[PDB]
Amino acid sequence: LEVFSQNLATFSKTLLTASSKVFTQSLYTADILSIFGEVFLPHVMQPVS
Amino acid sequence: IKTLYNYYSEGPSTPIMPHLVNRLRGLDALAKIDATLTKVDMNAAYIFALRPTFPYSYGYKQRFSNRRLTTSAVCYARTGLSSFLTVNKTYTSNSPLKGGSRGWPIFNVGVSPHVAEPHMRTLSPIGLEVFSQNLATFSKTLLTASSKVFTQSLYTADILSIFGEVFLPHVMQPVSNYTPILVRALLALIHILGPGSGNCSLSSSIFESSIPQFFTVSHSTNMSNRTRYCLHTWSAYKDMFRNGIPPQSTLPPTLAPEGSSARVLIPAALVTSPMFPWLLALVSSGPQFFLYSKDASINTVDIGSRGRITSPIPDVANLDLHRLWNLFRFDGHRYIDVVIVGVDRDYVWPYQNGVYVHGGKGPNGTDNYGNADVHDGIGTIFSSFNDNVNVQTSDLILGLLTLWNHITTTYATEEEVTMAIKIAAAFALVYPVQPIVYSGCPRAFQSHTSYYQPSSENCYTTDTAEVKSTWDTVELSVQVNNAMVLGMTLPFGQPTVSSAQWFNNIDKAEISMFKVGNLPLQNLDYLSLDMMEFYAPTTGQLYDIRSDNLILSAHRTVNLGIGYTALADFFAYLASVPAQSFYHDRMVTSPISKQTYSVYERFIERFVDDFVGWDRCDLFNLDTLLAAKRIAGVASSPIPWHCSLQRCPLPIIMHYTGLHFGQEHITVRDVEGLQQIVMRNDQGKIVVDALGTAAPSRLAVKLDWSRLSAWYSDTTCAIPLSDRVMEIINYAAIWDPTQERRATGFVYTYFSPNFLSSFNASEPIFNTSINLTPPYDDTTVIQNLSMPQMLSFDPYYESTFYVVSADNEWIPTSGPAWKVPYLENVVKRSGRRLLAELRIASNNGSGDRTFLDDV
Amino acid sequence: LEVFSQNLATFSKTLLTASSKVFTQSLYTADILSIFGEVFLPHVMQPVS
Amino acid sequence: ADFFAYLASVPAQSFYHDRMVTSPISKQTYSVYERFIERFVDDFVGWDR
Amino acid sequence: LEVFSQNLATFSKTLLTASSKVFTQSLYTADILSIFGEVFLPHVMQPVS
Amino acid sequence: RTRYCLHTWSAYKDMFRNGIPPQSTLPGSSARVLIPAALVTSP
Amino acid sequence: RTRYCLHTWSAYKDMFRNGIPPQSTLPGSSARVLIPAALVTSP
Amino acid sequence: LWNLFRFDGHRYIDVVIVGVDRDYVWPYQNGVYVHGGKGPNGTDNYGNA
């Protein structure tokens, strides 16, 4: 949902609501966010499977 | 709401400008919703957008026809040069070529003193925080949008400092306007591809087979409107303003753009975009490079008078095919500081090798380059624009297609696009000199004329396979070439006095102080701020497919340019503006040219303010009209000044104005509008004694527009092909009592037989297999699309003249006694019909009239 | 229908995500739609046969 | 078509090899045969004549 | 009118932004207005002719 | 006769920059038909 | 007669510190007129 | 009568010309060089006023 907010609205620090760096090399940092926003935009816009 | 049927059904009203402007607005609205631009093939949507065809049905009538078999068909007018054929740069030999001009005109456009009015905009969440910084005393709660999660992005605190330092006016008053760059984009696309009818030379026989697929880039220092570029990173650019203010400083912001010393902020992620070189263009001064067709042999074609298509024109070897891109000169920003934001000290310029960004990577491994080198022209950078570079049409327009896709979707509103289309329509097309054919006078009035012999002017064709029309008697000498080069016009009729000439091994351009128009500058601050996401986007869409794409927009501006040309021709036949007032010798032949220009500009200035909404003097001026020079050894043809500024044929004018010239206005039967004209000589013997009918006054046409319809088909005759004798001369003449010798003939602006043969195809493609032969051909007439004779021969003096019979047995009120043309517009392109005109004898029995009379 | 409701959706460009790829990369890009969606975009916009 | 040719009085010799050299009456008969065919095609087929 | 409503606007000086340039730099500065706005400021304040 | 050019989807994609044009170009290539591999074997 | 001095906007700006004074100085320079380049060519 | 009158106007005038390049040519008198425009011997950015 935060990636959806990134792709839907102009950037703001309040949009970053779920990411964290407490856990290292996990699926919850900002580079995973960039991955989701870069190579999976269709599935962010239309979550379907 | 309205359709082409409704527009073709209705005619002009007594207030013409309130009627013509509304009709043009409705035609533009129709052009908006016309499809045939997205799903169709690439070089068919382009050809439909840039070379629109106007259907029409011709036909002529005769008095005593016995089983006369005629063909009712549909033709497609089209006008406008799609390109220009000149001699190649390495010709020498100083000899004429069949269709090769020694030089081409330059329609130079200046910088408008007016500034496009910007409209309101809203700031991004980061921009609102900069507003809070500039509006309130500092607090840590004011910093609400910035973050350091994303490195070297547009959302950290240094970007905030940039916004607060060099863009404070735009933070306080968020405002933007984008019509200048849209105008330049539309003009660039249209000139690169070429609008019009496909004719690509001073001769009306050579055409362009289709839109070119390959271009070549050529460089010429002498005749290039180049601009200077400097490249910096943001750090070095800011550092160069620390020890005082250097000369030519771009640091202060701009609200009213000024020509020199501009600057643009370009993010690093957008430098690599294909739209960046086109964005540096369309705001700079142009053309910084010349665009040619890669091959002029597989693209140029020849059309005969009968419709014979010969592909290789006789002199393919020594000819270049300039696009309209090389015939236009634009003045924009002359010095641009391209400053890249979010870049370290080893940037490396991506496009051109050997070009180093100030503050970036140095020549040989060094970092933080300390030189702000100035590059002359956009070809020294952007390796795609180097000399002798061969480009495919897709790999050259794509960036443009990208740029227009972004601005019209993210940055600009629909009103800006509409204004851009309306403004760009003024420079959309280029038209050659107007040719005319004087029919002469009947032998009965040989002693009462100053213009007895038939003549022709500006009638040039190069086809040799078929028979050449006798009217075309133009030989392309140097003097004639220059005289016709000084004769091309724009949609509003403005000529140019600037020219270029590249041959032997020398390129030389003469650019006069007078310009054909002016264009507004693009404020680069709006571009920079939009490109850093400082403004909120206008729309969240990604594609302009469903709203104002580049091809549909360009189609709209081409339609509006042809409409401007048609309305200008109509205004010429409203103020009695002669064609000869727009030739090379317009400033010395007669002092009445200024008087005609007064009324013509009165019409144009009312049209522009009522429809375009821009300053009139920026789109049309008398500066180039009044700066005529005359070549030297070029003499004017002995033709009376009786025809207007017709640039497009009659069907286009009727389409854009509602003029009706059908067969209902041709009289066949008959109470006293006749007058006997009597003239005696010094011996008291009557020497004329002929019947005549008074030509209508412009007031009468104003109160009844069918008077103009009847005035046509009373003075109009079909143009003969093999002989210089018309069938109207044997019966009628023009009698002007205020003239010393009171008899004359008809002037009849004349296009070509080859040009009208090109009208047969429904799409402007002619390679080998297109059949341009006339429909149902049986046996010598070149078709009359010429507009009637002017209702007045003086721009200010109102006097009455007559159409006078010449034989004895013809009564002018009984109807014309020759081949009398008639026209219709026709929406649905139908096929050939073989019709028969017969006598009515009360025993006329035909199967169709007997059994097919139900409907 | 997925492609149609996709290209019709409102995005906010922003170089963080891939929506900005229609600007930084040619407008005939397949990183927001699919390759087939990019190819059949004109016909997806006007479905006729 | 044969019935229309009878109705429009179209001779059978207007469709031979010498239809154009014999006498111009062939085109005069075509000028009515075409009307008959055009009406029939515009009333039944619905395609361009 | 842009220049007039500009110089009439309330700012908070603060050396972070450019409004403070009328203090740290001569009061005839063109970093808040434009150069033309700075030049025509007295006449923008009182438009007469 | 008419000219036919046979490719694969992966090979046809690699001809152009990275994707194939929405509108087919001029030169063969005047027309383009996309056939799933399951329909090619049909009579 | 009167004395005329012709400059350009960019060159006229560089005479002073960085901007040109709102009030013209004493010495020529007793009066100043700003003309857009499109109006200079007018008769 | 032009010669019979004497008027007192401005004695010193600065013609500025805004929106022009560094190769500007004075279009009214040969041999007259605009400061910041075309120089005497084809030069650019003329330095003397």
Residue numbers in the entry:
A (entry chain A), C (entry chain B), E (entry chain B): 197 to 245
B (entry chain A): 70 to 739, 743 to 851, 854 to 929
D (entry chain B): 637 to 685
F (entry chain B), G (entry chain B): 295 to 321, 328 to 343
H (entry chain B): 393 to 441
From the study:
The double-stranded (ds)RNA virus Giardia lamblia virus (GLV or Giardiavirus) exclusively infects G. duodenalis. The GLV capsid comprises 60 copies of CP dimers named subunits A and B (CP-A and CP-B) in the triangulation number (T) = 1 icosahedral asymmetric unit.
The first high-resolution capsid structure of two GLV subtypes was determined using cryogenic electron microscopy (cryo-EM) single-particle analysis at a resolution of 2.1 Å and 2.6 Å for GLV-HP and GLV-CAT, respectively. GLV-HP tends to form aggregates and accumulate below the trophozoite plasma membrane and inside the cell body, whereas GLV-CAT does not form aggregates, is scattered in the trophozoite, and does not accumulate in the cell body. In the CP-A to CP-B direction, only two possible hydrogen bonds—Arg675–Asp928 and E872–N917—are present in GLV-CAT. In the C-terminal extension of the GLV-CAT subunits, similar swapping occurs structurally on the Lys902 residue. This additional CP–CP interaction, which is mediated by Leu320 and the variable loop in GLV-CAT, should make the CPs’ network in the capsid more robust. With the more robust C-terminal interlocking in the GLV-CAT capsid, the capsid assembly of GLV-CAT is structurally distinct from that of GLV-HP.
